[PDB]
């Protein structure tokens, strides 16, 4: 679920998902069009694609379980949708962690008109 993803993001990065990742660049929080602005925004682009891989799942609301094995995120077995959603979220949280070194506050609340053109998954 979105709330679970937000907790995973905070655990991983120390940033609150709202507002650090809810309106960032072209793809974080309301993704659709544009060239991703930076590596963090590319995490969101890929995460959007990952959810797009699951048209008959409901990643905003469906809850999954996971645990930590010495820092590592381990998705625990639920329904097929839950497992796949968890793997998408895990990857994005890791990606955000890997790209904190270039996170830029200037991309928070990024205006829609600066995001143009389709980019295929």
């Amino acid at each position: 679920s979105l709330l679970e993803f937000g907790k995973m993001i905070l655990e991983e990065t120390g940033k609150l998902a709202i507002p650090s990742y809810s309106s960032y660049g072209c793809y974080c929080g309301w993704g659709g069009k544009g060239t991703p602005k930076d590596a963090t925004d590319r995490c969101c682009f890929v995460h959007d694609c990952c959810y797009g891989n699951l048209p008959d799942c409901n990643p905003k609301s469906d809850r999954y379980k996971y645990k930590r094995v010495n820092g590592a995120i381990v998705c625990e077995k639920g329904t097929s949708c839950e497992n796949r959603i968890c793997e998408c979220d895990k990857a994005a949280a890791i990606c955000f962690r890997q790209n904190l070194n270039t996170y830029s506050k200037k991309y928070m609340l990024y205006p829609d008109f600066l995001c143009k053109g389709e980019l295929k998954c």
Binding site: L2, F5, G6, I9, I18, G29
Partner: peptide, 4 residues
């Protein structure tokens, strides 16, 4: 309320 609705995040990432």
């Amino acid at each position: 309320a609705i995040r990432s």
